[PDB]
């Protein structure tokens with residue numbers, strides 16, 4: 001079995017395969033701003049170009065990849081318009097001629113009108129040469145914010161984790177077939193292969209250190225990934241001129257927008273404890289609707305946890321634990337990234353919540 005409807009690719013997983021790089025001509029005015037955000041923010045010319053912008057119909061965005069590219073373009077255009085050079089000069093009102101098409105395209109794609117992980121990681125890459133493989137040396141992003149923002153490194157290393165994970169996600173029907181067929185040797189190899197693929201996924205995380213600089217990240221890139229839900233600089237949210245008369249709050253950023261970590265929680269039958277369910281539930285809202293439909297199709301399958309416990313078989317318990325441990329490792333290395341790239345630069349909250357989820361993962365071990 002596997003996807004079609006859930007849009008999980010055997011090669012790139014939750015990411016979008018071979019994402020579109022160009023929009024229809026009709027949207028040339030958008031593409032010019034997005035493609036020149038580095039030059040236009042540094043010069044301050046960006047906000048005049050957004051305000052002298054006519055309102056474009058979204059009707060000429062006809063396929064999914066075209067519409068995905070347009071959301072990335074409008075989201076990047078939007079983040080730069082709101083935060084500027086980021087030293088107190090915010091815009092609390094997004095101009096109708098960009099907000100209306102952005103909100104319309106968000107309604108259609110069932111995502112919030114703000115830059116989201118499915119935009120600038122999953123849909124925001126190209127291969128440099130397609131005849132060679134998916135490595136940092138042969139990959140590039142479509143959009144950045146500022147020269148030296150380390151957009152390239154932070155987005156692509158993020159995407160390479162999603163790709164490593166695809167190696168494990170594609171093993172997931174074998175688990176359920178082997179349970180269905182009471183084929184014990186197959187399910188064990190499937191668990192060991194999932195564990196092994198999460199352990200190689202952890203090794204991709206090591207690459208952040210070679211392409212993302214903590215200061216460039218904390219003081220540049222993270223301002224353009226900042227949202228307006230619970231933000232003092234936009235206490236009430238952002239006004240989408242012409243689409244809602246009321247200001248609306250939405251979050252930014254967050255590794256929590258990946259589906260990878262929650263995907264393996266559901267599989268392994270790891271439940272959340274605390275009220276943390278609310279936060280993980282809200283993270284699904286910032287995911288594409290197909291990927292959230294997938295995480296639900298997963299809870300509808302028989303419990304792999306109830307299956308391994310019911311057999312009394314110690315090899316299977318050890319392979320299930322290998323996966324759960326590989327998951328605590330990912331959450332630990334996450335945490336360690338938060339220390340280097342946020343906590344330390346902030347000294348020049350989110351960690352308590354993360355520690356709790358890791359504890360719940362570790363407590364899900366069997367032997």
Ligand SMILES: Cc1ccc(NC(=O)Nc2cc([C@H]3C[C@H]3C(=O)O)ccc2N(CC(C)C)CC(C)C)cc1
Nearest residue numbers: 115116117157158161205208253254255258337338
């Ligand atoms: C808009 C947007 C949204 C989302 C991302 N990615 C992210 O947040 N990446 C990210 C951030 C943090 C620390 C800032 C904290 C946080 O987020 O809790 C830690 C790990 C990662 N990952 C892997 C990295 C090794 C590249 C990502 C997932 C785990 C594969 C990038 C852009």
